[PDB]
Amino acid sequence: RHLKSGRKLNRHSSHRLALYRNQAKSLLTHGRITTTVPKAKELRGFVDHLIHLAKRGDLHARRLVLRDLQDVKLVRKLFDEIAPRYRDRQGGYTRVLKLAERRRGDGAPLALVELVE
Amino acid sequence: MIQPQTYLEVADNTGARKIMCIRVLKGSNAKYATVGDVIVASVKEAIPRGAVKEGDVVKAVVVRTKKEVKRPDGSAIRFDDNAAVIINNQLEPRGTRVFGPVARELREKGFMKIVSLAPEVL
Amino acid sequence: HPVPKKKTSKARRDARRSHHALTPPTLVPCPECKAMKPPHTVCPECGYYAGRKVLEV
Amino acid sequence: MKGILGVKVGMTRIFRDDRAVPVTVILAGPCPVVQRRTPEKDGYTAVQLGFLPQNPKRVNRPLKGHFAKAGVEPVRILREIRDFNPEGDTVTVEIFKPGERVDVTGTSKGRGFAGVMKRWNFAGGPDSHGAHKIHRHPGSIGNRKTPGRVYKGKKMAGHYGAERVTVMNLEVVDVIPEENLLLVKGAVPGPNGGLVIVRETKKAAK
Amino acid sequence: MNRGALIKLVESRYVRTDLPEFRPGDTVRVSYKVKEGNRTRIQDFEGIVIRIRRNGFNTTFTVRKVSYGVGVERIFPLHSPLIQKIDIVQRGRARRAKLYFIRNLSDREIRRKLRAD
RNA sequence: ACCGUGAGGGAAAGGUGAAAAGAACCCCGGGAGGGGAGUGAAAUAGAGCCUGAAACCGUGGGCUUACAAGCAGUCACGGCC
RNA sequence: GCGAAUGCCGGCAUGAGUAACGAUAAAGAGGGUGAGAAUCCCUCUCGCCGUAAGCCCAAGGGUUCCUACGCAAUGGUCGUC
RNA sequence: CUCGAUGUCGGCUCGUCGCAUCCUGGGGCUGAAGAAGGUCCCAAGGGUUGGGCUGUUCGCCCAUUAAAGCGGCACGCGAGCUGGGUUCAGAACGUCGUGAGACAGUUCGGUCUCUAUCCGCCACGGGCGCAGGAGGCUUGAGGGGGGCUCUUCCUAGUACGAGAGGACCGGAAGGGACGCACCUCUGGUUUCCCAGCUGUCCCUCCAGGGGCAUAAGCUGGGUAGCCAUGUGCGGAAGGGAUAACCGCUGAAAGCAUCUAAGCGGGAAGCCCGCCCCAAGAUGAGGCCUCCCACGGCGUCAAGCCGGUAAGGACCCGGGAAGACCACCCGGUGGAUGGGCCGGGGGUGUAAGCGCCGCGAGGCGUUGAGCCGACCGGUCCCAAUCGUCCGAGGUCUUGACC
């Protein structure tokens, strides 16, 4: 069992992928989103790559990302509306930033992360 | 690759190309009827006539499955598990034998006769 | 099954809750306005270091 | 009979025939950082370093404990007893040559905190008739009025990951005289890409 | 640098091109000769023809257990760069898919369809 | 009241103040509840609010404490205050 | 005129801020209301039922059902529900 | 003592002393030629297999082996399993009893609870100190770990010999079981990495996808990490003192004896030499470097404040170190993470269009398409900005400048 560990994840894989997706999506919707510390760390890694194909561009890159988030509206909104703007940059198309505040009863430290303008 | 209580083919005069070995002869602490080794046992399978019977001898390890890493890093794994029955002196008991070349055996060496004996496309 | 015996009493509850102890929050001046904040997070005023995008509505 | 270093990985190599494998060891420049000369420190020895990590960052004292006979920009430092210094800087290259016998060691990869299961051998209890602690767990800790209690120093669960140790004897096999590298054929005595060293004793029969 | 770097190097040094064989092919039952020898440095262009099963991959690699039918099934795994080998000539096919470890053959072949692939 | 199927079982809780004069209004607060002002002989008599001690929990001051194995204590002595 | 009866009644500590929150059918986002909302409201992602967690009659319950306010108590915390 | 109670067999799991020593060596002895035996004294170091049947520890049998020892701790172990056993009602027979019911004669089933307080063990940190205040390199009193053993061959077939048979002495090689690391090889996993697949509801009909078919629906494969069945290594020499047992020089026993005198030999055993702990050994710290004596008040002012970043702490970003924790490297004058990028190893030629085929699909562009931890570039993203605490350096005696 455990030692040298790569890609830090919680819940259960099906859930995880579930989240990564949903949030990846909601964000693509709002540019900037609010969640808990790692929610962000990772959502960063994933939405990072995702927008990377968004830009990647073409019938394929597209087909892939839809394979993923299942919805044209966005599909496109993304792939052709912002993706480009980024497309020339260099990965890390996102900004993960911690806030000074915790969710209730728990103290969960959270923050916001968004398409990186 | 190894075993104690075991079921393995042979092919010599073998009244049954199979027996069951208690243990590896070597240094008291067998634990692995090792390739190219030798062991203790009884027959499990039937011998029409034969002369072999349903007794027990001493024999040498041929084939095996799971890791024949020869010294020079030459390698092979047999998809069968057998030995040649030895009759205690070591010297083998039979006419022929079904199996091919591949030193590991000869590396043991003593049984060259085996060596010569079984040697082809079978 | 395994109930202790009685308590070094004070001695105990103490020694223990003691090494326990409780501290306060590490903090510094705002990367912009007033008060302070933690090692890296905007806040309901000087909402930034480069683009607040946060403080009041 | 001493080399200082950071090692890479164990990998196979061929020989007169077959092959087997060694491990990649690299020792840039072991250099005389301080000498404990006996009148100084009885366990007379050579204290050295072997590389250089970013200069911007550099404690003062260090800057000078160094200054002493001044060297440079590393942080990799330690030392060995009864090892004269036929130099004011040694390498590895030639320092050691293959066909030579070596002893060597360093950090011990960091396992974790595992009971009888791990820790030691005899992988705990059993499984089929007993599942109230299923397959295995921890043996027996002592006795009533035997000593009247629990023992005092037998194997035990826990931290058995972060420690230090050594490889008695192993082979020099070969030296790549430039980037002070050695293929040793040894038990990769600790993580790769890490703290490792060479020392060599063997006044005994075979 | 590190690993990749230096090591890549040393091996390069002795392993050298494994006699530019680059004759990987699929699982071709192809045929070869290893110096494999003993007794009086009787090294022999030993040749086993065999249906190749997979391989080991970096400096040290291996033209895998090409399985061959002798008396029964017997499989031969070879160390690639290893000077042990001299001759490695292709006879059979680098044909049919799914990636090795398809011992399907040895498994329960029937040379019939065995062939059929 | 409450437990029990029915039979049946079968507690707790008395004492704010002389008399209500028992809490305007201002001050933090979502409130509570806390600070003032007036009651008043007292309110450390304030709504469970007489007298309200023991247990245990708190805040502050003196002495005290990290080479130490003693239910307790305690006889002597020295250092503190 | 009482340590003392594993006594009786009523306080009060002790484990202990570890055990534990009632089913391994998952959540996450956005806006919203608010004194404060992981834990209320609308809305957009996603999982679990579905022959049941679905509809219905009857039994037994007996308030409650709604609408408006309200949370100090009660939900094994939260809570403007 | 114990009954307001001490859970008794057997077996696991983990053992720990003992020697009347099984195997290991050292030994004087022989009815010792060699060899191999048997006989005692010394020495517990290490070692002291697998099955079978029986709830049996015992024991008999199978096959080995150097051997496969006896026995101490409630015949060690239920707050650590197991519970066949014996030791709750049944029902059973055999057996008794006029029977009730019985038999330590059998036989078939028959509810081991356990959220650690002490002391104790194994580990991990917060203290406060080894009288300047600091970062890093050390030597260890002494504490711990391993100390086994078999087989082949040379000198040798000579020493012995009638012959069959085989020595010291000493030197090689291989293995057994065990301990310590570690992945290259071999190998196992790999919960998402790749590929095929059935059924079904949705996307938008098509193909081209999506969840659910466990917490992956089903398969065939798969790094890296963790990991044997896989790989290196070890159990040493060797030095000093000793056991039994042997001698030496020698009287007291005016010859003689290892003997009180003084000398030497001498076991895998003992001390050391091998590794791994460690001055909270307050009875070290040894050494390298470097900060320098601030301010304000009753003084043996070893008391209150800013003080040196001399340093280090916090928080941030990371780490095969890791429950926490501390450990460790970095924080933008930096590659630390992730993103990207190239590169190793993955799946096994994609999505589309093109081509033969009623068709099913086949073939081509594609050995492509997609790729999680692997080697490494690159500030594209996010390590901003800041805070605190942290010497002034006791008294006394001796020594030098």
Short mmCIF file of N, CA, C and O (backbone and C1' of nucleotides) in Angstrom, two decimals, chain H residues 185-241:
data_model
loop_
_atom_site.label_atom_id
_atom_site.label_comp_id
_atom_site.label_asym_id
_atom_site.label_seq_id
_atom_site.Cartn_x
_atom_site.Cartn_y
_atom_site.Cartn_z
P C H 185 13.86 -3.52 -15.85
"O5'" C H 185 14.58 -4.90 -15.49
"C5'" C H 185 15.38 -5.54 -16.49
"C4'" C H 185 15.46 -7.05 -16.28
"C3'" C H 185 14.20 -7.91 -16.11
"O3'" C H 185 13.61 -8.30 -17.37
"C1'" C H 185 15.84 -8.53 -14.50
P U H 186 12.00 -8.37 -17.53
"O5'" U H 186 11.61 -9.66 -16.70
"C5'" U H 186 12.31 -10.88 -16.87
"C4'" U H 186 11.96 -11.83 -15.76
"C3'" U H 186 10.50 -11.83 -15.33
"O3'" U H 186 9.74 -12.73 -16.13
"C1'" U H 186 11.91 -11.76 -13.43
P G H 187 8.14 -12.55 -16.24
"O5'" G H 187 7.58 -13.33 -14.99
"C5'" G H 187 6.37 -12.91 -14.40
"C4'" G H 187 6.63 -12.53 -12.99
"C3'" G H 187 5.50 -11.82 -12.29
"O3'" G H 187 4.42 -12.73 -12.03
"C1'" G H 187 7.61 -10.88 -11.68
P G H 188 2.98 -12.52 -12.78
"O5'" G H 188 2.14 -11.62 -11.77
"C5'" G H 188 1.72 -12.14 -10.51
"C4'" G H 188 1.31 -11.01 -9.58
"C3'" G H 188 0.43 -9.96 -10.20
"O3'" G H 188 -0.89 -10.42 -10.20
"C1'" G H 188 1.93 -9.00 -8.64
P U H 189 -1.97 -9.58 -11.01
"O5'" U H 189 -2.08 -8.23 -10.19
"C5'" U H 189 -2.92 -8.17 -9.07
"C4'" U H 189 -2.62 -6.94 -8.32
"C3'" U H 189 -3.29 -5.70 -8.85
"O3'" U H 189 -4.57 -5.58 -8.25
"C1'" U H 189 -1.04 -5.28 -8.32
P U H 190 -5.65 -4.60 -8.88
"O5'" U H 190 -4.80 -3.36 -9.43
"C5'" U H 190 -5.04 -2.05 -8.90
"C4'" U H 190 -4.18 -0.97 -9.57
"C3'" U H 190 -4.61 -0.39 -10.90
"O3'" U H 190 -5.62 0.60 -10.75
"C1'" U H 190 -2.27 -0.68 -10.87
P U H 191 -5.94 1.56 -11.97
"O5'" U H 191 -7.33 2.23 -11.60
"C5'" U H 191 -7.46 3.13 -10.50
"C4'" U H 191 -8.91 3.23 -10.14
"C3'" U H 191 -9.24 3.90 -8.82
"O3'" U H 191 -9.83 5.17 -9.09
"C1'" U H 191 -10.34 1.79 -9.04
P C H 192 -8.95 6.39 -9.65
"O5'" C H 192 -8.36 5.85 -11.02
"C5'" C H 192 -7.43 6.61 -11.79
"C4'" C H 192 -7.56 6.25 -13.26
"C3'" C H 192 -8.43 7.18 -14.09
"O3'" C H 192 -7.63 8.23 -14.58
"C1'" C H 192 -9.24 5.01 -14.36
P C H 193 -7.88 8.82 -16.04
"O5'" C H 193 -6.57 8.35 -16.80
"C5'" C H 193 -5.71 7.36 -16.23
"C4'" C H 193 -4.98 6.66 -17.34
"C3'" C H 193 -5.87 6.10 -18.44
"O3'" C H 193 -6.21 7.12 -19.39
"C1'" C H 193 -4.23 4.49 -17.79
P C H 194 -7.48 6.94 -20.37
"O5'" C H 194 -7.06 5.68 -21.26
"C5'" C H 194 -5.98 5.82 -22.19
"C4'" C H 194 -5.73 4.55 -23.01
"C3'" C H 194 -6.86 3.73 -23.65
"O3'" C H 194 -7.42 4.33 -24.84
"C1'" C H 194 -5.25 2.26 -22.73
P A H 195 -8.91 3.93 -25.34
"O5'" A H 195 -8.80 2.38 -25.69
"C5'" A H 195 -8.16 1.95 -26.88
"C4'" A H 195 -8.29 0.46 -27.06
"C3'" A H 195 -9.69 -0.12 -27.10
"O3'" A H 195 -10.30 -0.06 -28.38
"C1'" A H 195 -8.43 -1.33 -25.56
P G H 196 -11.91 0.03 -28.50
"O5'" G H 196 -12.39 -1.47 -28.29
"C5'" G H 196 -12.14 -2.44 -29.31
"C4'" G H 196 -12.71 -3.79 -28.94
"C3'" G H 196 -14.19 -3.88 -28.61
"O3'" G H 196 -15.04 -4.01 -29.72
"C1'" G H 196 -13.03 -4.88 -26.90
P C H 197 -16.61 -3.83 -29.50
"O5'" C H 197 -16.90 -4.71 -28.22
"C5'" C H 197 -17.14 -6.09 -28.37
"C4'" C H 197 -18.07 -6.54 -27.31
"C3'" C H 197 -19.30 -5.67 -27.14
"O3'" C H 197 -20.30 -6.05 -28.08
"C1'" C H 197 -18.32 -6.12 -25.04
P U H 198 -21.73 -5.32 -28.07
"O5'" U H 198 -22.52 -6.04 -26.89
"C5'" U H 198 -23.02 -7.37 -27.04
"C4'" U H 198 -23.93 -7.71 -25.89
"C3'" U H 198 -25.06 -6.71 -25.67
"O3'" U H 198 -26.23 -7.08 -26.39
"C1'" U H 198 -23.87 -7.09 -23.64
P G H 199 -27.38 -6.00 -26.71
"O5'" G H 199 -27.95 -5.61 -25.29
"C5'" G H 199 -28.76 -6.52 -24.58
"C4'" G H 199 -29.24 -5.86 -23.35
"C3'" G H 199 -29.81 -4.50 -23.68
"O3'" G H 199 -31.18 -4.65 -24.00
"C1'" G H 199 -28.35 -4.37 -21.83
P U H 200 -31.96 -3.47 -24.76
"O5'" U H 200 -31.96 -2.27 -23.70
"C5'" U H 200 -32.67 -2.38 -22.48
"C4'" U H 200 -32.25 -1.27 -21.56
"C3'" U H 200 -32.62 0.11 -22.03
"O3'" U H 200 -33.96 0.37 -21.63
"C1'" U H 200 -30.39 0.06 -21.15
P C H 201 -34.91 1.35 -22.50
"O5'" C H 201 -34.42 2.82 -22.11
"C5'" C H 201 -35.26 3.70 -21.34
"C4'" C H 201 -34.51 4.95 -20.90
"C3'" C H 201 -34.15 6.01 -21.95
"O3'" C H 201 -35.25 6.92 -22.17
"C1'" C H 201 -32.29 5.60 -20.56
P C H 202 -35.26 7.91 -23.47
"O5'" C H 202 -34.01 8.90 -23.21
"C5'" C H 202 -33.92 9.72 -22.03
"C4'" C H 202 -32.61 10.48 -21.98
"C3'" C H 202 -32.29 11.38 -23.16
"O3'" C H 202 -32.89 12.68 -22.99
"C1'" C H 202 -30.36 10.14 -22.52
P C H 203 -33.34 13.55 -24.29
"O5'" C H 203 -31.98 14.16 -24.85
"C5'" C H 203 -30.89 13.32 -25.16
"C4'" C H 203 -29.62 14.12 -25.31
"C3'" C H 203 -29.43 14.74 -26.68
"O3'" C H 203 -30.04 16.04 -26.74
"C1'" C H 203 -27.55 13.42 -26.13
P U H 204 -31.59 16.22 -27.19
"O5'" U H 204 -32.14 14.74 -27.42
"C5'" U H 204 -31.53 13.86 -28.35
"C4'" U H 204 -31.35 14.55 -29.68
"C3'" U H 204 -31.00 13.67 -30.85
"O3'" U H 204 -32.12 12.87 -31.26
"C1'" U H 204 -29.66 15.61 -30.94
P C H 205 -32.11 11.28 -30.99
"O5'" C H 205 -32.34 10.66 -32.43
"C5'" C H 205 -33.12 9.50 -32.62
"C4'" C H 205 -32.79 8.90 -33.96
"C3'" C H 205 -31.31 8.54 -34.10
"O3'" C H 205 -31.03 7.23 -33.62
"C1'" C H 205 -32.05 9.76 -36.01
P C H 206 -29.52 6.70 -33.58
"O5'" C H 206 -28.99 7.01 -35.04
"C5'" C H 206 -29.18 6.08 -36.09
"C4'" C H 206 -28.01 6.15 -37.03
"C3'" C H 206 -26.69 6.15 -36.29
"O3'" C H 206 -26.30 4.81 -36.04
"C1'" C H 206 -26.72 7.92 -37.85
P A H 207 -26.08 4.32 -34.53
"O5'" A H 207 -24.50 4.34 -34.42
"C5'" A H 207 -23.72 3.60 -35.35
"C4'" A H 207 -22.73 4.49 -36.05
"C3'" A H 207 -21.72 5.22 -35.18
"O3'" A H 207 -20.63 4.36 -34.93
"C1'" A H 207 -22.73 6.75 -36.63
P G H 208 -19.13 4.93 -34.85
"O5'" G H 208 -19.28 6.42 -34.29
"C5'" G H 208 -18.26 7.38 -34.56
"C4'" G H 208 -18.32 8.51 -33.57
"C3'" G H 208 -18.33 8.13 -32.10
"O3'" G H 208 -17.03 7.94 -31.59
"C1'" G H 208 -20.05 9.63 -32.49
P G H 209 -16.85 7.22 -30.17
"O5'" G H 209 -17.73 8.11 -29.18
"C5'" G H 209 -18.20 7.56 -27.95
"C4'" G H 209 -18.42 8.66 -26.93
"C3'" G H 209 -19.04 8.24 -25.60
"O3'" G H 209 -18.07 7.65 -24.70
"C1'" G H 209 -20.36 9.91 -26.56
P G H 210 -17.84 8.18 -23.17
"O5'" G H 210 -19.19 8.85 -22.65
"C5'" G H 210 -19.12 10.01 -21.81
"C4'" G H 210 -20.44 10.31 -21.15
"C3'" G H 210 -20.90 9.31 -20.11
"O3'" G H 210 -20.25 9.52 -18.89
"C1'" G H 210 -22.68 9.79 -21.55
P G H 211 -19.55 8.30 -18.15
"O5'" G H 211 -20.65 7.85 -17.10
"C5'" G H 211 -20.94 8.69 -16.00
"C4'" G H 211 -22.30 8.38 -15.43
"C3'" G H 211 -22.48 7.02 -14.79
"O3'" G H 211 -22.15 7.16 -13.39
"C1'" G H 211 -24.27 7.52 -16.31
P C H 212 -21.88 5.86 -12.44
"O5'" C H 212 -23.10 4.89 -12.73
"C5'" C H 212 -24.40 5.21 -12.25
"C4'" C H 212 -25.38 4.13 -12.64
"C3'" C H 212 -24.87 2.73 -12.35
"O3'" C H 212 -25.19 2.41 -11.01
"C1'" C H 212 -25.87 2.83 -14.52
P A H 213 -24.10 1.71 -10.09
"O5'" A H 213 -24.11 0.20 -10.59
"C5'" A H 213 -23.83 -0.14 -11.96
"C4'" A H 213 -24.75 -1.25 -12.43
"C3'" A H 213 -24.15 -2.65 -12.61
"O3'" A H 213 -24.32 -3.43 -11.42
"C1'" A H 213 -25.29 -1.99 -14.57
P U H 214 -23.27 -4.61 -11.05
"O5'" U H 214 -22.38 -3.99 -9.87
"C5'" U H 214 -21.99 -2.61 -9.87
"C4'" U H 214 -21.86 -2.09 -8.45
"C3'" U H 214 -21.18 -0.74 -8.27
"O3'" U H 214 -22.22 0.25 -8.24
"C1'" U H 214 -20.28 -2.36 -6.79
P A H 215 -21.95 1.73 -7.68
"O5'" A H 215 -20.73 1.61 -6.68
"C5'" A H 215 -19.38 1.76 -7.12
"C4'" A H 215 -18.54 2.31 -6.00
"C3'" A H 215 -17.18 1.67 -5.84
"O3'" A H 215 -16.20 2.23 -6.66
"C1'" A H 215 -18.23 1.63 -3.77
P A H 216 -15.33 1.26 -7.57
"O5'" A H 216 -16.43 0.68 -8.59
"C5'" A H 216 -17.30 1.56 -9.30
"C4'" A H 216 -17.09 1.42 -10.78
"C3'" A H 216 -17.74 0.22 -11.40
"O3'" A H 216 -18.81 0.86 -11.98
"C1'" A H 216 -15.47 0.30 -12.01
P G H 217 -20.19 0.80 -11.27
"O5'" G H 217 -20.71 -0.62 -11.82
"C5'" G H 217 -19.78 -1.57 -12.46
"C4'" G H 217 -20.45 -2.90 -12.89
"C3'" G H 217 -19.49 -3.97 -13.45
"O3'" G H 217 -18.93 -4.88 -12.48
"C1'" G H 217 -21.11 -3.50 -15.07
P C H 218 -17.58 -5.68 -12.83
"O5'" C H 218 -17.89 -6.27 -14.27
"C5'" C H 218 -18.82 -7.33 -14.45
"C4'" C H 218 -18.49 -8.08 -15.70
"C3'" C H 218 -16.99 -8.22 -15.93
"O3'" C H 218 -16.38 -9.24 -15.16
"C1'" C H 218 -17.96 -7.49 -17.91
P U H 219 -14.78 -9.32 -15.13
"O5'" U H 219 -14.42 -9.97 -16.53
"C5'" U H 219 -13.10 -10.25 -16.85
"C4'" U H 219 -12.98 -10.41 -18.32
"C3'" U H 219 -11.64 -9.96 -18.78
"O3'" U H 219 -10.79 -11.07 -18.58
"C1'" U H 219 -13.29 -8.93 -20.11
P G H 220 -9.32 -11.05 -19.18
"O5'" G H 220 -9.57 -10.46 -20.62
"C5'" G H 220 -9.06 -11.13 -21.75
"C4'" G H 220 -7.85 -10.40 -22.20
"C3'" G H 220 -6.87 -10.24 -21.05
"O3'" G H 220 -6.04 -11.40 -21.15
"C1'" G H 220 -7.36 -8.15 -22.05
P G H 221 -4.61 -11.46 -20.42
"O5'" G H 221 -3.92 -10.09 -20.86
"C5'" G H 221 -3.33 -9.19 -19.92
"C4'" G H 221 -2.75 -8.00 -20.65
"C3'" G H 221 -2.01 -6.99 -19.79
"O3'" G H 221 -0.66 -7.36 -19.69
"C1'" G H 221 -3.47 -5.85 -21.23
P G H 222 0.22 -6.78 -18.49
"O5'" G H 222 0.23 -5.20 -18.72
"C5'" G H 222 1.46 -4.47 -18.88
"C4'" G H 222 1.24 -2.99 -18.61
"C3'" G H 222 1.14 -2.54 -17.15
"O3'" G H 222 2.43 -2.13 -16.61
"C1'" G H 222 -0.77 -1.80 -18.35
P U H 223 2.96 -2.69 -15.18
"O5'" U H 223 3.26 -1.41 -14.27
"C5'" U H 223 4.59 -1.04 -13.93
"C4'" U H 223 5.13 -0.12 -14.99
"C3'" U H 223 5.91 1.09 -14.51
"O3'" U H 223 7.34 0.86 -14.65
"C1'" U H 223 4.11 1.69 -16.00
P A H 224 8.25 0.47 -13.36
"O5'" A H 224 8.09 1.73 -12.41
"C5'" A H 224 8.55 2.99 -12.82
"C4'" A H 224 7.68 4.06 -12.24
"C3'" A H 224 7.32 3.85 -10.79
"O3'" A H 224 8.42 4.15 -9.93
"C1'" A H 224 5.41 4.50 -12.00
P G H 225 9.05 3.00 -9.00
"O5'" G H 225 8.32 3.23 -7.61
"C5'" G H 225 8.21 4.55 -7.07
"C4'" G H 225 6.95 4.67 -6.24
"C3'" G H 225 6.79 3.53 -5.26
"O3'" G H 225 7.35 3.93 -4.05
"C1'" G H 225 4.82 3.74 -6.55
P C H 226 8.21 2.91 -3.20
"O5'" C H 226 7.12 1.85 -2.69
"C5'" C H 226 6.23 2.16 -1.61
"C4'" C H 226 5.22 1.05 -1.38
"C3'" C H 226 5.71 -0.38 -1.24
"O3'" C H 226 6.12 -0.65 0.09
"C1'" C H 226 3.92 -0.33 -2.76
P C H 227 7.19 -1.83 0.37
"O5'" C H 227 6.76 -3.00 -0.62
"C5'" C H 227 5.64 -3.84 -0.33
"C4'" C H 227 5.47 -4.93 -1.38
"C3'" C H 227 6.59 -5.96 -1.55
"O3'" C H 227 6.55 -7.04 -0.59
"C1'" C H 227 5.69 -5.34 -3.66
P A H 228 7.80 -8.07 -0.49
"O5'" A H 228 7.16 -9.53 -0.61
"C5'" A H 228 7.99 -10.70 -0.52
"C4'" A H 228 7.67 -11.65 -1.66
"C3'" A H 228 8.73 -12.69 -2.00
"O3'" A H 228 8.37 -13.86 -1.22
"C1'" A H 228 8.00 -11.50 -3.95
P U H 229 9.22 -15.23 -1.32
"O5'" U H 229 8.77 -15.79 -2.73
"C5'" U H 229 9.55 -16.76 -3.41
"C4'" U H 229 9.49 -16.50 -4.90
"C3'" U H 229 9.99 -15.15 -5.36
"O3'" U H 229 11.43 -15.15 -5.25
"C1'" U H 229 8.04 -15.82 -6.55
P G H 230 12.34 -16.22 -6.08
"O5'" G H 230 13.12 -15.22 -7.06
"C5'" G H 230 12.65 -15.01 -8.40
"C4'" G H 230 12.93 -13.61 -8.89
"C3'" G H 230 14.22 -12.96 -8.46
"O3'" G H 230 15.29 -13.44 -9.26
"C1'" G H 230 12.48 -11.42 -8.30
P U H 231 16.67 -13.86 -8.57
"O5'" U H 231 17.39 -12.45 -8.32
"C5'" U H 231 17.91 -11.66 -9.42
"C4'" U H 231 18.58 -10.38 -8.92
"C3'" U H 231 19.57 -10.53 -7.77
"O3'" U H 231 20.85 -10.89 -8.27
"C1'" U H 231 18.16 -8.66 -7.38
P G H 232 21.97 -11.45 -7.26
"O5'" G H 232 22.46 -10.15 -6.46
"C5'" G H 232 23.46 -9.26 -7.00
"C4'" G H 232 23.93 -8.22 -5.98
"C3'" G H 232 24.55 -8.71 -4.68
"O3'" G H 232 25.94 -8.93 -4.85
"C1'" G H 232 22.90 -7.13 -4.19
P C H 233 26.67 -10.14 -4.07
"O5'" C H 233 26.42 -9.77 -2.55
"C5'" C H 233 27.04 -8.61 -2.01
"C4'" C H 233 26.50 -8.29 -0.65
"C3'" C H 233 26.70 -9.31 0.46
"O3'" C H 233 27.97 -9.09 1.02
"C1'" C H 233 24.56 -8.32 0.58
P G H 234 28.83 -10.33 1.53
"O5'" G H 234 28.31 -10.54 3.00
"C5'" G H 234 28.46 -9.49 3.92
"C4'" G H 234 27.53 -9.69 5.05
"C3'" G H 234 27.77 -10.95 5.85
"O3'" G H 234 28.70 -10.60 6.86
"C1'" G H 234 25.45 -10.67 5.37
P G H 235 29.82 -11.64 7.30
"O5'" G H 235 29.09 -12.46 8.44
"C5'" G H 235 28.24 -11.80 9.38
"C4'" G H 235 27.50 -12.85 10.13
"C3'" G H 235 28.46 -13.99 10.35
"O3'" G H 235 28.96 -13.85 11.66
"C1'" G H 235 26.44 -14.79 9.36
P A H 236 30.42 -14.36 12.00
"O5'" A H 236 31.33 -13.65 10.89
"C5'" A H 236 31.47 -14.19 9.58
"C4'" A H 236 32.89 -14.02 9.09
"C3'" A H 236 33.98 -14.24 10.11
"O3'" A H 236 34.21 -15.62 10.41
"C1'" A H 236 34.56 -12.45 8.66
P A H 237 35.39 -16.03 11.42
"O5'" A H 237 36.35 -14.76 11.35
"C5'" A H 237 37.75 -14.90 11.25
"C4'" A H 237 38.26 -14.17 10.04
"C3'" A H 237 39.69 -13.73 10.19
"O3'" A H 237 40.51 -14.78 9.72
"C1'" A H 237 38.38 -11.89 9.53
P G H 238 41.33 -15.64 10.79
"O5'" G H 238 42.08 -14.51 11.62
"C5'" G H 238 42.73 -13.42 10.94
"C4'" G H 238 42.57 -12.13 11.71
"C3'" G H 238 42.96 -12.12 13.18
"O3'" G H 238 44.34 -12.19 13.46
"C1'" G H 238 40.97 -10.93 12.95
P G H 239 44.83 -12.88 14.83
"O5'" G H 239 44.58 -11.75 15.92
"C5'" G H 239 45.36 -10.56 15.91
"C4'" G H 239 45.04 -9.71 17.11
"C3'" G H 239 45.04 -10.40 18.46
"O3'" G H 239 46.35 -10.61 18.98
"C1'" G H 239 43.16 -9.01 18.32
P G H 240 46.56 -11.67 20.17
"O5'" G H 240 45.75 -11.05 21.40
"C5'" G H 240 46.27 -9.92 22.09
"C4'" G H 240 45.42 -9.59 23.28
"C3'" G H 240 45.14 -10.78 24.16
"O3'" G H 240 46.24 -11.15 24.95
"C1'" G H 240 43.11 -9.72 23.74
P A H 241 46.37 -12.67 25.43
"O5'" A H 241 45.23 -12.76 26.57
"C5'" A H 241 45.11 -11.77 27.62
"C4'" A H 241 43.88 -12.01 28.51
"C3'" A H 241 43.61 -13.42 29.05
"O3'" A H 241 44.28 -13.68 30.27
"C1'" A H 241 41.60 -12.51 28.21
#
